[PDB]
């Protein structure tokens, strides 16, 4: 499944690109995965758009 | 890791009991796991307190 690692810089590109799969935590300093088994094509876009390369498939 | 399945009834007991691990999604109808690898003891409490038995360890 999809995970956000500790390299997250809170860029929030993933939230803008794929809102159905990524949300920011309450603190607002790390993205959260709402559906870790998503097949949406925006997932690939979010991974490719993360500067921190924080989004991975485990 | 910890997951919330589709049986979630949005009881939000998990959010009250272990706020560092569970948050509600934006719609507010499903809990989200902020740290799926957490070892906090409140995780066990949240699992035990979920009426829907929606929280599991995969
Ligand atoms: S830095 Fe974090 S907020 Fe999203 S764009 Fe990369 S996972
Ligand atoms: S119903 Fe859902 S909101 Fe939490 S208490 Fe059970 S996982």
UniProtKB/Swiss-Prot annotation, chains A, B:
InterPro entries: 3Fe4S_ferredoxin, 4Fe4S_Fe-S-bd, 4Fe4S_Fe_S_CS, Fe-S_cluster_ET. Pfam families: Fer4_13. Disulfide bonds join 18-42. Gene3D superfamilies: 3.30.70.20. Transmembrane segments: none annotated. Residues 2-27, 30-58 form the 4Fe-4S ferredoxin-type domain. One of its GO terms (molecular function) is electron transfer activity. The modification Cysteine methyl disulfide is found at residue 11. PROSITE patterns: 4FE4S_FER_1, 4FE4S_FER_2. Its cofactor is [3Fe-4S] cluster; [4Fe-4S] cluster. Homodimer (ferredoxin I) or homotetramer (ferredoxin II). Ferredoxins are iron-sulfur proteins that transfer electrons in a wide variety of metabolic reactions. This is Ferredoxin-2. It comes from Megalodesulfovibrio gigas (Desulfovibrio gigas). The lineage of its organism: Bacteria, Pseudomonadati, Thermodesulfobacteriota, Desulfovibrionia, Desulfovibrionales.
